[PDB]
Every structure is written in structure tokens, then in C-alpha cells.
Amino acid sequence: SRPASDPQVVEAARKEGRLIIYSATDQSSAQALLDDFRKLYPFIQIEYNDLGTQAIYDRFVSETAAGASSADLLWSSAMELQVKLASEGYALPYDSPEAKNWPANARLGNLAYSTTLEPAVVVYNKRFLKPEEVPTTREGLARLLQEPRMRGRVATWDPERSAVGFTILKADYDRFPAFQELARAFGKAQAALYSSTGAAFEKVISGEHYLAYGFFGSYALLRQRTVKDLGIAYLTDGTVAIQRVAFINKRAAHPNAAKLFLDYLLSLRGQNLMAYTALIFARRETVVGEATPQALYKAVGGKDKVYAIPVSTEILKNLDPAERMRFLTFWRQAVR
Ligand SMILES: [Mg+2]
């Protein structure tokens, strides 16, 4: 069907004719969304800048201060960075008509929106770890990582070099005491730390590592369609889900193109294309496909086992010096 964007916003977006996106969403996953939006609105030519979460922040802030040509729309899994920008005057306020049922903890009033509910999962190479061998608990994974065969065979986030690796491992540390025991097992097994999903996945695919902890269900699902040896396990003791935040650049050259794309992302049509075709874990619970809330809830044993990190100014507490220090000091000691 068609997103409910105001007719005058559609006309204004046609007058602009262009959309510059800075996004952390790997273009392999985002591409079907771009294709489908272009079908809907063929008079908009999309520039997709596939960038790291930190590079998106640094570049946008830098370009804004220079007064330069920057993005129309920012889309990133680094939830703290997005909520910081959107709460500091970088955001165009827009009441998306596709968000009327968005929970208040899934939006920053009209300044920024959740676009997904993406689980941090375990992926593994079935040539080296059989499904029956991969625990679904932090305590279980801590036990597996005592085995001599797992030494140098574990991949996870570097939370000091990836802003979303921070978001995910911070939420994990805050919510699950058993994360402490697991982090020490990352030490024991001499886990390697990566700043992107792609770099962790390529090591699991080659067998250089057997297991990767905390990377996006979305990317795991998509990579499985081409790599039959890739397995996915969901955490039954509790799953962290990020919500990819989209907001519009207050100083966008193409504010209405950005509005149409944000509406598209939040719409039934865009959320179903996420769930079904892009294999991005959708935010709306009324979707069909592999990458849905209902599939996530089923795999982990209930919606109550999922900690969805809120799209809230309260999460800026993770950028407080004292808060950052306690987590990174614990982490560094544990994993070296
Ligand atoms: Mg990416």
C-alpha cells in the first residue's frame, strides 16, 4: 500500500528530487528498501552513504559546523549518538503520520524514531560447532569458552572502537549479571574484538573463529541465504535489541524527501519489506517474514526475555564519564 505522508509533503519532495542518507545499515540489507521506495516515488534519486556509526556522527557534526552540504536523513544503530544529535538541535521536528501508534519509548517526541527491533544474537559456523553444541545462555557460553578448542575461536564487539558495539555490550552489562562471567570467558578464550559485523562474520565464515557474540540478527539472516554453514542461536536468558534511530537533518537541503523516506520506513509496507525481503528485524508487530518481533519472541521464549533499548534521552546516561569508565574498566580487565 502507500505511506500516509501528507500530499503537500509528496509534492515538496518531488520539487527536491533527491535524498542523501548517512546510514550504518549495510547496503546489502538496506538495498531492497531503497529499490521499493524508488518504485513508490521514482522522481527521488537516493544517495546512500554506508558508513560506520562513529564516522556518521563525526562527519555530520563536522559538516554542520562548517555550514556545508550534509545528509537529509541519518539512520544508525548507535542509539546514544543518534539520541544525542536529535536532542541537541540537529533534528527537524516532524510528526510522522505512520508513527501514530509508536510507543513513547520508541520515539523522541517528533525529533527521532525507532525503525527496527534488532536482536544481538550468536552466529556460529556449523562445520565447526553443531547446533546441539551452542548454548543459548551467557553462563552456557562461558562454559563452552573454557574448552581448549575455543581458544582464539571467539569474535565479539570492540566497544571502544564501535559506537553500536558499545550500545549493545553496555545494555548487556547493565541488564544481565551473567554477562560478567561471559566477558571473563572472552578473556579465557582470547576473543578477538571487531568494529563491524562484516569483519566478525568473514572470520566465522572462513572458520578462523567458530562463534561471534552480539552481532545483528538482521545481517545473520541475510548472510545465511548465501552461506548455508552459518548458524544463529538466540539468547533464552535474555536478548538485547537495538532500535535503529532515523531522524531528519534540521538543515537538510531535501527535508520533504527525508519525511517521505522516514514515513516509508515506519509504514506497514516498509516494515513488511524489512521483515520479508531485507531480513531487517522490523519494529511493528503486524509484519510477516523471517525478521519479525513474533519470530524473535518465539526463539528466546517470550517478549518478556527481550530488553528493547528505549529511544530516550535517558540512554545518554551511557555517555556519562563515570558510567562509561565503570563499564570499559570492567570490560578491559575481563577480556585481556
Ligand atoms: Mg554497517
What's a concise summary of this model?
The chain is an alpha/beta fold.
Descriptive report:
This protein has 336 residues and is of the alpha/beta class. The protein folds into two domains: 193 residues, no CATH class; 143 residues, no CATH class. The protein contains 13 helices and twelve strands. Strands 5, 6, 7, 8, 9, 10 and 12 form a seven-stranded mixed beta sheet that branches. Strand 1, helix 2 and strand 2 form a beta-alpha-beta unit. It is globular, with a radius of gyration of 20 Å. Bound molecules: magnesium ion.
| Main sheet specs | 7 strands, mixed
> Ends: how far apart?
52 Å
Oligomer state equals: monomer
Strand tally, please? 12
Shape estimate: globular
Structural class: alpha/beta
Q: How large, in whole angstroms, is the Cα Rg?
A: 20 Å
Organism: Thermus thermophilus (strain ATCC 27634 / DSM 579 / HB8)
Protein name: Iron ABC transporter, periplasmic iron-binding protein
Binding site for Mg(2+) 1: 24, 26
Binding site for Mn(2+): 26
